[PDB]
Amino acid sequence: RPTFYRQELNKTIWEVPERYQNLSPVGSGAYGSVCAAFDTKTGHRVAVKKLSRPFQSIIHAKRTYRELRLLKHMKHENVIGLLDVFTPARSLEEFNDVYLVTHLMGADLNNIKLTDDHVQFLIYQILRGLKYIHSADIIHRDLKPSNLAVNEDCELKILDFGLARHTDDEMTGYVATRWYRAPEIMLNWMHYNQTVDIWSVGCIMAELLTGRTLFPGTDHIDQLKLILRLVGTPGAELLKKISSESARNYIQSLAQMPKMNFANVFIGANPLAVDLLEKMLVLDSDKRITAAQALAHAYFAQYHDPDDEPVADPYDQSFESRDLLIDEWKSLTYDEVISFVPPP
Numbered sequence: 001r002p003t004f005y006r007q008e009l010n011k012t013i014w015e016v017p018e019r020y021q022n023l024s025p026v027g028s029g030a031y032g033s034v035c036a037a038f039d040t041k042t043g044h045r046v047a048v049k050k051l052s053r054p055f056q057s058i059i060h061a062k063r064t065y066r067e068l069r070l071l072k073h074m075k076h077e078n079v080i081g082l083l084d085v086f087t088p089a090r091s092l093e094e095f096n097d098v099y100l101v102t103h104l105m106g107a108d109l110n111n112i113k114l115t116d117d118h119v120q121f122l123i124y125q126i127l128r129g130l131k132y133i134h135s136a137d138i139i140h141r142d143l144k145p146s147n148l149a150v151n152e153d154c155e156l157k158i159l160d161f162g163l164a165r166h167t168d169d170e171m172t173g174y175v176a177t178r179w180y181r182a183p184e185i186m187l188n189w190m191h192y193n194q195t196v197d198i199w200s201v202g203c204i205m206a207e208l209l210t211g212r213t214l215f216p217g218t219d220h221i222d223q224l225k226l227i228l229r230l231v232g233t234p235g236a237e238l239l240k241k242i243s244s245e246s247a248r249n250y251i252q253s254l255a256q257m258p259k260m261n262f263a264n265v266f267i268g269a270n271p272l273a274v275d276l277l278e279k280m281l282v283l284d285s286d287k288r289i290t291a292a293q294a295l296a297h298a299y300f301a302q303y304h305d306p307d308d309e310p311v312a313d314p315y316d317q318s319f320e321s322r323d324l325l326i327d328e329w330k331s332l333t334y335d336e337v338i339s340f341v342p343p344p
């Protein structure tokens with residue numbers, strides 16, 4: 001057991017191992033209550049997260065367990081991973097607080113004149129991380145520029161696992177939190193799956209090529225009209241797959257529109273980039289390109305290496321369908337804290 005020391009940060013008393021020094025508040029609070037520090041064991045600048053009220057309700061206790069399970073699983077160069085997890089508690093009986101440690105992320109994609117070569121390398125890395133995530137049967141659901149960390153060498157990592165489900169108010173109006181969402185999830189058309197993430201990668205790729213948001217809708221309905229003007233209105237085959245009779249009836253009220261010519265929308269872009277966008281931005285999610293297929297596309301010929309695009313160990317999420325009491329979720333979380341083994 002390390003020695004812990006106390007200090008007052010972000011309105012509470014933080015208690016952390018002596019290895020973590022020079023603690024200083026950082027960020028807007030998007031990922032929780034976070035301090036920057038220097039880790040004397042590894043030599044890395046790190047982010048230290050103190051969870052607020054981890055076990056206050058069944059909802060919060062299960063949320064805390066989910067975040068810790070996901071972060072413990074992810075071991076890939078293009079995905080956020082866990083450097084450490086700790087508690088000052090000496091037993092289950094006194095366990096109340098959880099602290100998570102990751103690499104400190106400076107800039108996101110938002111923060112960064114991009115050459116076609118820059119767009120190839122950034123989208124290649126998102127797809128390499130997504131092939132890994134999808135091989136574990138994990139769906140990200142919230143890929144957007146603010147969730148992509150990027151360094152001076154253009155190296156990228158994917159963020160945002162096991163945080164609170166976004167609220168209806170958070171998805172309302174002229175907001176970046178909705179602009180990257182697949183239409184079948186934005187409007188609850190059907191049971192969605194991992195294909196929603198490939199729609200998001202198409203929206204990000206288009207914005208790196210043009211410098212402009214692809215679908216900056218003022219509300220859900222304005223955004224749907226911008227999407228159907230580009231990719232066309234649904235045919236009989238997709239309309240059958242829309243489970244909601246009410247959503248099917250609204251779609252049928254709109255005048256039919258053909259798919260647009262993407263060479264006339266993305267004027268001057270690499271023709272191989274135009275071809276890949278056509279295969280990501282397909283309205284029927286069954287017909288979209290997969291991450292594994294997209295890595296083998298000719299746009300990435302300079303970076304693609306089939307012997308260095310790894311898959312994940314299997315990920316058991318049977319807990320997601322389990323009903324437990326607060327103290328049961330708290331005991332599962334405690335076991336995951338004390339069993340943690342750090343990376344080499």
Ligand SMILES: Nc1noc2ccc(C(F)(F)F)cc12
Pocket residue numbers: 031032034047048049067071080100101102159160161162163
């Ligand atoms: N659950 C997470 N997804 O992405 C993250 C980035 C940082 C942190 C941190 F450092 F605050 F713990 C947590 C997460």
Ligand SMILES: [Cl-]
Pocket residue numbers: 002003017018019020
């Ligand atoms: Cl220590």
Ligand SMILES: [Cl-]
Pocket residue numbers: 079080081082103157
């Ligand atoms: Cl990392």
Ligand SMILES: [Cl-]
Pocket residue numbers: 087088089094095096097098
């Ligand atoms: Cl504690």
Ligand SMILES: [Cl-]
Pocket residue numbers: 110144145146147176
């Ligand atoms: Cl964003």
Ligand SMILES: [Cl-]
Pocket residue numbers: 314315316317
């Ligand atoms: Cl597992």
Ligand SMILES: [Mg+2]
Pocket residue numbers: 142160163
């Ligand atoms: Mg998110």
